[PDB]
């Protein structure tokens, strides 16, 4: 894969959260596992510099932008650079969804990165009202408890002035009054929800020495200790899954319900298993597409080919599927194969009748013409009629694959065409 300019993944226009289909195509193409890192921060904290120097390089649409670039310190894996552009620009556009953009940047990424310019005073905390709504904005089980299961590692970044600051800087004070109660909600969440936490600092690049290397340390940290986006026990997210998650979360927001973590995984399983069926079906029309040539000699042969190919395609289902709880897909696959069988059997019977009647016509119509003219009413034609009919039946069966319904129809010919032989013997 190769992108030179980051494009919009979720635009935030006309008071609506919409996905970008052209950018979802690029996701559905990248089949390599992903390490997702967002860059959340206010509208002009210089958000870009942490992307160009992260992907490795050198008046827009607001929302979440992405940049896919190969992982510079990993094989196979591919890191994704999310970035909330225009976050908080009260002047430019609607702000009903800044909390939504925050929640989505949490749910999609694997290492959440805030980017404030201040000194984490009370102002920089009042500019972080998004985190006080995470318990009101994101469900996790169709409660705010299992958040540490999938929540990313916090990496704060102060762009003008390390972890010594942050470790004690979120030490909430004890109390019970309402005045100190509001002071807990931000710091309570940043500590309890996110598994690993951090902090960084960056000197100003004006009026550089301890900045390029200062940011090089942070970039090396992100390159080194970043972890692959996991869902529920492994399952390294990889393109198509990220697209499924984006679509699920957005179609949940623009529908009413909350972005669920369980449902966004159940639908992903029921779509990545909805491909296992159409994969095991193609492996059935392909194998039994040149292993069967109707009509067949016997029936045990066709049933022996089925019983083989069925449990051979069931293997293809197992090899590319997971979480078929209650075994709902591993029976809509079987019921879709038994119908194929019951149809193949009737198709074979009809294809047997076809060739039987065709050979009937081809071989016996000469005799029909001969007796139709009267070349056998001569006083001596009964014996030669017997000769030709017996040897012609001898030339009937020495014709491979006449179908199981072989002579069953043939007797309908002889039994209904005996008055000819009757009159011939009478005319002898």
């Amino acid at each position: 894969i190769h992108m030179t300019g980051p494009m919009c993944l979720i635009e935030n226009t006309n008071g609506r959260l919409m996905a970008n289909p052209e950018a979802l195509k690029i996701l559905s193409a990248i089949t390599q596992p992903m390490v997702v890192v967002a860059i959340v921060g206010l509208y002009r904290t210089g958000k870009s510099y942490l992307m160009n120097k992260l992907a490795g390089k050198k008046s827009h649409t607001k929302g979440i932008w992405m940049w896919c670039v190969p992982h510079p310190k990993k094989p196979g894996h591919i890191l994704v650079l999310l970035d909330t552009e225009g976050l908080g620009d009260v002047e430019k556009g609607d702000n009903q969804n800044d909390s939504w953009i925050f929640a989505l940047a949490v749910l999609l990424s694997s290492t959440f990165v805030y980017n404030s310019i201040g000194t984490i005073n009370q102002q920089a905390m009042d500019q972080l009202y998004y985190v006080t709504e995470l318990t009101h904005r994101i469900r996790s089980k169709s409660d705010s408890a299992d958040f540490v299961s999938f929540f990313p590692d916090f990496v704060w970044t102060l762009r003008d002035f390390p972890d010594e600051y942050l470790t004690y800087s979120l030490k909430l004070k004890k109390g019970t009054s309402q005045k100190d109660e509001t002071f807990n909600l931000p710091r309570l969440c940043i500590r309890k929800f996110f598994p690993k936490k951090k902090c960084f600092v960056f000197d100003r690049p004006v009026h550089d020495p301890e900045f390029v290397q200062q940011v090089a340390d942070f970039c090396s940290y992100i390159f080194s200790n970043s972890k692959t986006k996991t869902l529920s026990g492994g399952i390294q997210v990889n393109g198509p899954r990220l697209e499924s998650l984006v679509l699920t979360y957005v179609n949940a927001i623009s529908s009413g319900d909350l972005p669920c973590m369980e449902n966004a995984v159940l639908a992903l399983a029921q779509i990545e298993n909805s491909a296992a069926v159409q994969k095991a079906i193609a492996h059935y029309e392909q194998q039994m597409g040149q292993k069967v040539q109707l009509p067949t000699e016997t029936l045990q042969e066709l049933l022996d080919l089925h019983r083989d190919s069925e449990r051979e395609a069931i293997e293809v289902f197992i090899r590319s599927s997971f979480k078929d709880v209650d075994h709902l897909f591993q029976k809509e696959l079987a019921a879709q194969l038994e119908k194929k069988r019951d149809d193949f059997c009737k198709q074979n019977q009809e294809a047997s009748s076809d060739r039987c009647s065709a050979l009937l016509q081809v071989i016996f119509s000469p005799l029909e013409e001969e007796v139709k003219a009267g070349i056998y009413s001569k006083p001596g034609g009964y014996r030669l009629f017997v000769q030709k009919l017996q040897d012609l039946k001898k030339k009937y069966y020495e014709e491979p694959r006449k179908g199981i319904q072989a002579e069953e129809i043939l007797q309908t010919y002889l039994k209904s065409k005996e008055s000819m032989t009757d009159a011939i013997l009478q005319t002898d």
């Binding site: 206010l42 002009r44 908080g88 009260v90 002047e91 702000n95 009903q96 310019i117 201040g118 000194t119 005073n121 102002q123 009042d126 500019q127 009202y129």
Partner: protein, 214 residues
């Protein structure tokens, strides 16, 4: 005059706090006042207050994301007021030609007069209990988090949502508007009879009423 503006602006510069970018603010003020610039933005300066004398001709004031407490007297020529995410307690009288009032995440207690030229307006994330009559052409209103008690009367395209409030009442004045209004009033502890009263009311020829989301 003009040189008298520089006096009060250079006098605010001194009466500031440690982490209060006032030199940049004064530089922006002199950058606007001299070029006769219509726009003036004091984006992110950790300001605890503003000077008493803004330029008397601006049409756009963006003083959001600060630690303000009360705005100075806005110039009459103002047409857009973007003052959100700071700590306001009351709004000085709005200029008569105002067209956009964007003030959220503050601590407003009540709203003063609203001129007839307010097109859009966002007062969400505050502590308001009552609102004056919304102007004739007020298009979008966001009061998504306050302490409202009763829905305001409109003085007849419209789209206001009063999410997350303690209002819980719909009189006739709502059901007298045509099928162009949109009043999302979700997350409200509405009356037990008014809860399905809307259901059996909306399941009727309600093409002489408004859309009501809850």
């Amino acid at each position: 005059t003009y040189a008298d503006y520089f006096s009060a602006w250079d006098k605010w510069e001194k009466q500031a706090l440690p982490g209060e970018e006032r030199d940049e603010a004064v530089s922006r003020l002199k950058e606007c006042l001299i070029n006769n610039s219509d726009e003036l933005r004091l984006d992110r300066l950790n300001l605890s207050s503003l000077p008493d004398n803004l330029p008397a001709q601006i049409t756009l004031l963006n003083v959001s994301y600060n630690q303000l407490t009360n705005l100075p007297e806005l110039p009459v020529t103002l047409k857009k007021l973007y003052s959100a995410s700071n700590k306001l307690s009351e709004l000085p009288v709005l200029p008569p030609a105002l067209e956009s009032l964007q003030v959220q995440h503050n601590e407003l207690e009540n709203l003063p007069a609203l001129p007839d030229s307010l097109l859009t307006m966002n007062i969400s994330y505050n502590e308001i209990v009552s609102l004056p009559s919304l102007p004739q052409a007020l298009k979008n209103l966001r009061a998504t988090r306050n302490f409202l008690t009763e829905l305001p009367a409109f003085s007849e395209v419209r789209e206001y949502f009063f999410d997350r409030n303690q209002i819980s009442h719909i009189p006739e004045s709502i059901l007298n508007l045509r099928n162009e209004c949109s009043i999302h009033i979700s997350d409200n502890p509405l009356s037990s009879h008014a809860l399905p009263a809307l259901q059996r009311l909306t399941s009727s020829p309600d093409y002489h009423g408004p859309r009501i989301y809850f």
